[PDB]
Symmetry: D2
Subunit: 396 residues, 4 copies
């Protein structure tokens, strides 16, 4: 009923009985480059494979991308259990260096799902990046890395221009005093949550685990707090790129994140967002869905989406219940990992000629997915969204 | 944002830009008995015709019922504009003077048993059961009506101390409550009466059951063409208290100005809608609402939430028994509820609930169910457009099954 | 009671009111209530303010009424512990800006030492200023209450309210000008704004009209009074009921019962909490002191908030935030003791004891006096916790001290 | 108005416009043992010197205590600027109720006149009682802080909390027993309950481990400290950082900076408002007085809440409700001045002036002393509004008076 009291009844004896809602982004390098390691990392919880173009050639990275996709499709046999895995391109940065311009285009042909643009100071910088990507890769999400003072002063215009934000504490603190950094992090996560755009907490997550099999406690709580701050994704850098224990870092990331979900006071964030008028049918539909979900404790909110946006709008209001976003578009299934609470699910079944049946096919597919992964059981109540349409149905 | 501010920013210069959500129940008698008067009263806003069986014969009342129905069906030509009109039977109840604070032991007077039986065959929509002291009394009334009238809504008149003390068990047993204020103050001190009224309206609102404010609404208008305002503000406060319906007695039954009383009732009620602080009541109910597990309930919740979220012109609900519309009205949306039904009784009974605008579809049942549903939806759409609830392009919420919510633009 | 709905739900007519009446009763005095012996009864029945309607009567007539009111009032002066202050109000005839007839009536009010003035047909701030100017330096400590009786008064209510010391909603004159469906809106609006601004508001005209000829009121009238109290009105007024009717005394006794009952239906938490949200933020020691006092009073369920005041103003500031606990305003100024009845919840108490040379002793004297007053009237008992407000200096405008003390 | 907005309006361009409210506890050892280093650490912000009795003899620690007090009293010349410094004794505890070794260390604590004791491996209330029993009537004024370091301690935290005067979350020992991912939950749980109960809680172990060998810390450590402050911790503790490391002085200066910054990110409205909702109705004058004071302080943005206290409890009760304004606790008891550092927001101030025979004057003396302290340290200036709390009678337990006064 109150935040204080919610903190008071936190029980370490009760295990987390929810899936992880925070996305895990892993930087891939020498340590994690191999197909067999990537397999295990996906099994460990990796959602997005980051490529750092500060070093390496196009040939090198292209082989990394090939391995990532090879490993990912090893599980394609079971579509029910198949885990979509996004591919992110992180630019070297300085407006837009001559070198970046080629990496972005390389990104386009390599069909990357998103782009981490470095050292963004203003909206015009994001536009230039948008321009460079052009019509060809306009469906590639642009995530603006804030790494300096001006970027902070002009965060609002940057956020609107971008599809998402990355808080790079490492680069931030070189520029700004270390004691000011955590303030910037909380500010940006807040505004991104307010604006309903994905935010990523990045750099120096579990630096200790480069040489060690377990992390410190200052790192363990920092990750958890980032999740509690409202971050959509958490990122591992050197931990998975070069370290001795890349696989342990992911498994630890998973454990901490899943635990941190319990400490989340869902009532507050949802209710505060409600406090802050539309005319968009889909939006009003998403609102009703999230409201209903709290009132009947739904196992999940099943959403049929093509571009991902309808699921994104549901995630905006931050339901407790997991969002099962059903899509046949493999890119949107991969991009969905940027948003907290969305569990993307790729339907490989053939398009049924009868549209009503084809919709029912994708719904029941999600239903099977939910039961298998332990989201709900037969008899549980779930909400299904289709198109402007909300539906409260029992699980078959 | 706060209740104080809402009252402060009330502007009498700005006219009410909403329809009346409170039901008007008119007692019918000598003054309003004629078909031509009833016609006018329906156009003036009468929703429910009450019959007082304290006086009159079965022959007399039967003639009243015939006139009411005759007048009502004069508008049946246009189903788009047709306004359902309920028929209520108010029983005489057990009599003796009155003994304050005592526990009495009649139940259902011999005279009532005959009136209720008359009600069933006359096909009355609801019954105002007099002098209810306990749940067992409501059960006897339910049993007396039997299988014959199981669909007749029973409204329990609280008129004494014991009834108040045992209100909770009475409310659960009943389909609705009538605060018969007139009889209350005879039993209980006049200064205690307003407390009882507010208590009972509160609990009925909490329980999602219709409550009626009754007796001496506008007594002055029996002889006068306008009422006092002490009566006018009393009506307004009853509306603000949360009453679903307001009732005229002698005002329309015997008085010189029965038609003026209804038009005045309409004006005051419609005005009082503006003074309603909708956010509070809606939010307090959200807060008091338990976790359900009922699909239909969860559907109604999302609908009301959404309606606030997009300022919907209306919440269109397809219903058979009225129940689905009732569940939506429970959470008290600002937007009017257009309850679409083919059951004419359900269309008439809907007037007991605040905010529900019942609408009777007379179109034939289409063999294709999807088409038949769309037919009733578009019917409501024409219904909304005609009465000025919304226009083409406006956003409205449509409920169907019952588990489905839909946010659609007006054709 | 976490919600307003539940508060209404938990209303019990079986449980009797265990609070004093906080709403003031203003009685119009005329032929029926003129006699000293009747006035006694009305004071014993609960009358707080005697209104004089200058629509009719001569100065000779009214002057004797004032003499009658004061004679009856001072009959109880023997016991200062139980003495009930009784205000004298002058209600002007008004234009049928300021009619010449009013100009002499106001001056007459000054000479007669009236506590307040009900100014009729106020349309704007300049009207209130004219009334203020007319009263002049002579009686500038007389509270001006602006009667809103028309549309323009309603449209320009805000400028009128600041200029005035209080507001009177005259539904009777209102309903003539404005439609029989719009006043209750006007009534609630004006009471709201007066509550927001911390200025006394009075509900007037057609309170219990039935009781002119009848020994009992109607059912519509009883709830109308109750709702006015629940709306937030500081005072309720009887007109013909007490002026000419057959049962002026029964009207007061009924007014008292209804008002006392309506106190139970008040959801104190809301109004107090809503004012906290809207309170600006100050730097006035006296204001901050009052806030803490009202807060403390809720947090420890105080029997009363005892306030030493000279002009009444400090007690007014406590009442602004609407505590549940009664405010015992201790004063030696007899005028302010009479004027205090304009404010809901303030129980004025007149100390007649001589001024002690030691100021600390004089303060303690007035405090213990209130303590005895509280015990006598059944506000609290020995051992109960009460809040006492005082200042650091023997002057007015310096109350900065809050004290949580047990009842001796 | 909302938590989201408050986070959104965080501005790194605006420097912190507050003093540090979180206490800094420094473990003292070889690196920080010298009088001249301790001097610097006090100037850097050290409030409490911890002694780890896992190693070392009574001889060793006794000299440490002597140096701590020597360094502390070097500033005693100016009482206005004098900074009280507490002395904490951290027991070794049972290894694999109260070990035979601890019993001697605790008695050693009594003779050395330690201000508080960190009791290790507390599993239950009986353990805290045993520690209290051992300390006996001798040291009954020594605060007992129960170190939670295992599964059972967590499970039975509530009974432990009531028995103790405070709690220490020893994360280091916690994660050995419980999974590292479960710990932050335990930390937040215990800090919450201590905040709820108004008892001091300490975040301990592995604050800035990196600063043992490095001149600056990592960011995972920097944000961990900040979050502990935001969680609601009253004190933060440095261990090896100041005990043995190469940069003990840099650790304190860094601790201070992070803590001061984290104060800005605190959403004071929420915690204060949530506590009043959960606050029970109390008949204690001192409690109601503290409530009114904190309310007033928010309502007038007070520079400080000045509290005259003897045993410390009255300042503790004000801090319970978590005001934004700093609490200046005035006392002549040097132990309570040292113990005050356990509570967030309390700035203890030791009056060395002689006791005036006139008590009213003696009270005024201590008040103006706090006023000078506040002006000097930049808490407020002449003219600012501050809240002053005092009592009606000398001795402990009688503070019932709140006063809103301007700064001379
Ligand atoms: O989230 P998006 O990209 O707006 O797409 C939502 C669409 O998906 C659907 O659920 C299914 O549409 P398709 O069968 O064409 O994929 C539609 O109801 C709706 O228009
Ligand atoms: O309101 P009720 O009595 O529960 O019935 C609601 C019914 O109305 C409908 O919307 C229409 O069904 P019908 O074709 O029988 O009229 C159904 O979806 C639902 O079963
Ligand atoms: O309500 P007012 O007009 O401010 O009067 C309050 C004043 O009364 C006092 O309590 C005492 O004043 P007096 O001794 O002159 O009556 C002061 O502390 C305070 O300034
Ligand atoms: O916090 P504590 O221990 O109750 O001390 C509060 C005491 O301090 C005082 O303000 C001053 O008393 P002393 O002269 O003994 O210091 C008393 O009024 C009050 O009883």
């Amino acid at each position: 009923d109150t935040f204080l009291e919610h903190m008071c009844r936190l029980d370490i004896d009760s295990p987390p009985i929810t899936a992880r809602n925070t996305g895990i982004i892993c930087t891939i390098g020498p340590a994690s480059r191999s197909v067999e390691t990537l397999k295990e990392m996906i099994k460990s919880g990796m959602n997005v494979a980051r490529l750092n173009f500060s070093h390496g050639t196009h040939e090198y990275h292209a082989e990394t991308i090939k391995n990532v996709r090879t490993a990912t499709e090893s599980f394609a046999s079971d579509p029910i259990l198949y885990r979509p895995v996004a591919v992110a391109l992180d630019t070297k940065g300085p407006a837009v260096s001559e070198k970046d311009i080629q990496d972005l285009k390389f990104g386009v042909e390599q069909d990357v799902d998103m782009v981490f643009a470095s050292f963004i100071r203003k909206a015009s910088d994001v536009h230039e990046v948008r321009k460079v990507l052009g019509e060809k890769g306009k469906n590639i999400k642009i995530i603006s890395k804030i790494e300096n003072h001006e970027g902070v002063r002009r965060f609002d215009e940057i956020l609107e221009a971008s599809d998402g934000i990355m808080v790079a504490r490492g680069d931030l603190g070189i520029e700004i005093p270390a004691e000011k950094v955590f303030l910037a992090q909380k500010m940006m996560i807040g505004r991104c949550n307010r604006a309903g755009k994905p935010v990523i907490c990045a750099t120096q997550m579990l630096e200790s685990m480069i040489k060690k099999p377990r992390p410190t406690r200052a790192e363990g709580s920092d990750v958890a707090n980032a999740v509690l701050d409202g971050a959509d994704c958490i990122m591992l850098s050197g931990e998975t790129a070069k370290g001795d224990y890349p696989l342990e870092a992911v498994r630890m990331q998973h454990l901490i994140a899943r635990e941190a979900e319990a400490a989340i006071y869902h009532l507050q964030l949802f209710e505060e967002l409600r406090r802050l008028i539309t005319s968009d049918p889909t939006e009003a539909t998403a609102v009703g869905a999230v409201e209903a979900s709290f009132r009947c404790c739904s196992g999940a909110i099943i959403v049929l989406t093509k571009s991902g946006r309808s699921a994104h709008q549901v995630a905006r209001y931050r339901p407790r219940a997991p969002i099962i976003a059903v899509t046949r578009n493999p890119q949107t299934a991969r991009q969905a990992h940027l948003y907290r609470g969305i569990f993307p699910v790729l339907c490989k079944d053939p398009v049924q000629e009868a549209w009503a049946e084809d919709v029912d096919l994708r719904v029941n597919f999600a239903m099977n997915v939910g039961k298998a992964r332990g989201f709900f059981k037969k008899g549980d109540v779930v909400i299904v969204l289709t198109g402007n349409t909300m539906r409260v149905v029992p699980v078959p």
